[PDB]
């Protein structure tokens, strides 16, 4: 993306095109959340043991 900062895309970039930049950034970030939670479940299982 142009910038990791959402505001630096949405603020200055033309609203049409901006959706492309934003959508890309969203996908990127969602992937880290999915990764994070997956690992936490695994760690939790170890704690249960």
């Amino acid at each position: 993306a142009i910038s990791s900062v959402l505001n630096d895309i949405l603020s200055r970039l033309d609203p049409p095109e901006a959706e492309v930049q934003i959508d890309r950034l969203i996908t990127g970030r969602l992937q880290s959340l999915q990764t994070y939670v997956t690992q936490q479940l695994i760690r939790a299982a170890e704690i249960r043991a």
Partner: protein, 48 residues
């Protein structure tokens, strides 16, 4: 800012010897050359 001296300049340089000037210290209205066509080519990037 004296954009008049940029777009309404009497003389322009050749491309092999393109020239540059610094523009500063003002309040600039950018709609003047945008919402009123004065160009055959108008392409901006990064910022609308």
């Amino acid at each position: 800012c004296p954009f008049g001296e940029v777009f309404n300049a009497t003389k322009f340089p050749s491309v092999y010897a393109w020239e540059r000037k610094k523009i500063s210290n003002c309040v600039a209205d950018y709609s003047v050359l945008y919402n009123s066509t004065f160009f055959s080519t108008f392409k901006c990037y990064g910022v609308s």
